[PDB]
């Protein structure tokens with residue numbers, strides 16, 4: 185019959201596990217990609233970017249997505265020890281790491297049996313192979329259940345404060361700002377809201393989005409960054425605006441601007457790792473101490489520094505002469521993700537918006 | 547716990563068509579089933595339409611068994627703010643879905659399929675046009691719009707600089723629209739100009755509502771102008787004109803907007819500039835086309851609107867048919883974990 189019309193209809197389709205980590209979307213694509221050339225997760229990401237970028241666009245943007253959508257493609261692992269390969273994507277490009285989506289992915293690996301649950305277990309390890317290195321996750325099980333996840337935590341790739349007290353001149357009305365740059369899986373410009381002359385509130389979202397874009401543009405133009413072990417990482421993809429908390433349980437509140445100036449509704453896992461490295465570098469957070477970060481929505485992530493390391497003969501701008509090498513810390517983050525749908529994305533060839541669009545200005 | 551749907555769009559404008567998972571909903575006509583959803587179960591709409599499952603320009607509907615005689619499919623429309631269609635674009639989507647997926651059957655060797663929708667507002671009569679050599683591939687859909695009419699003509703509304711005073715026509719096609727040339731506002735219609743068109747459209751809407759006080763003659767509940775339709779020269783030379791409808795809480799229609807097309811049509815038609823059976827083509831801000839024609843006109847004795855002249859016996863009203871294409875962009879199973887702090891959604895949109 186017209187089951188031939190269904191073969192046809194599904195041609196070039198993708199299956200996804202639609203999730204969110206505390207309000208922030210994680211559209212996890214589980215099939216429909218062909219083989220993508222590349223020896224590692226970094227090379228697969230570049231391949232996707234240089235040759236098949238219309239895929240990111242149609243999956244992330246209206247009408248299938250929206251100006252603040254986020255997601256990822258899964259792959260077989262390449263790296264030894266890894267359960268899953270993952271490349272992240274968004275409305276602008278491809279982050280080398282993402283905490284909220286890594287939490288979601290750990291959760292989904294376990295809740296759908298991608299990874300199997302050792303009979304009588306409380307914690308299930310799930311190791312993601314990312315463009316930034318191995319990320320070791322743990323799904324913390326709902327104690328009297330088979331595969332029901334309470335929350336998920338990740339041990340991030342080594343994070344470190346990169347350059348301190350950088351002056352960036354933005355145009356009026358914002359003027360001159362002081363920022364730290366730090367790596368937490370992505371490079372971040374960390375800036376106090378107080379300096380943008382704007383409060384973190386829903387009401388000021390569009391202005392915090394403008395200001396993040398200008399800051400990100402101006403940093404990349406003025407300041408060259410380079411990850412000392414990962415040559416492919418050499419820009420600042422995200423801006424962290426922080427300010428006083430609203431939930432008293434939380435050290436601070438933040439919004440992250442990234443992608444095509446979209447805002448994280450989560451507190452942002454990599455950005456959390458990046459603030460933690462910074463305070464820790466400054467002797468303002470101790471190993472083991474709990475740091476709680478609140479989002480614009482009021483979502484919470486919990487973090488702690490599990491250890492530190494000094495790497496002899498490797499310096500970054502912030503590394504003083506009196507130091508024997510650069511400081512990195514290993515940060516853990518914990519949060520909760522939910523499955524919000526099992527989606528099959530279709531692309532009618534006659535659809536003028538099979539490759540997505542945004543009405544976002546300029 | 548879970549809902550099934552067909553994600554669609556009508557030339558860019560989202561239409562989430564929920565095809566199962568609602569509980570049993572009472573009502574002896576669709577308007578009562580809509581009231582019951584509103585009064586007892588609004589949370590379903592919110593979680594299906596708002597982030598994270600949705601977004602601030604999401605629209606859609608719930609499919610039901612039809613009740614009205616003649617009807618093929620029951621439906622209640624919804625969006626992130628409420629329970630109306632607006633622009634009518636879900637109707638095109640649902641007519642298409644119904645044929646595409648088997649809800650409605652196709653007579654053999656048939657080229658066009660009637661799909662009649664049972665909505666809270668009355669029957670909506672549509673036709674699915676079949677792709678030449680196929681049995682249920684839909685090329686497009688036509689909808690018979692609610693009766694439309696020019697209401698008031700050459701209205702002078704005074705806007706703050708830089709817009710100034712602006713000549714508009716006010717016309718009904720499901721909502722009342724203020725139809726206003728882009729030239730009049732001094733903004734060229736483009737995506738990059740959209741926020742300027744938005745500012746201006748709101749300015750215009752508040753200014754008209756404050757000064758002109760419009761009233762549907764047979765529908766007293768409709769006493770404002772909720773949409774501003776900004777038109778100008780087309781980019782596609784197949785199209786008569788190009789437009790963007792500004793409506794809601796600072797929102798733009800990505801489609802040409804079917805009811806605005808029907809309003810624009812009754813306007814041209816009243817001024818002697820469109821003929822019955824003439825294909826009018828309208829382009830959106832993203833380049834899509836809708837096609838309309840006026841099928842017929844009527845007079846309504848003893849009922850008058852401002853544009854109705856002293857010697858005319860009743861207002862002029864027209865019936866237009868609006869054609870457009872809806873695409874299927876997904877088949878989704880949505881889930882609501884009861885412990886999900888966002889099972890009923892959120893919005894970061896502010897006013």
Ligand SMILES: O=C([O-])c1ccc[nH]1
Pocket residue numbers: 279281282283284285422440442448450451452453454455
């Ligand atoms: O969770 C994160 O690391 C992240 C980065 C951008 C959005 N979320």
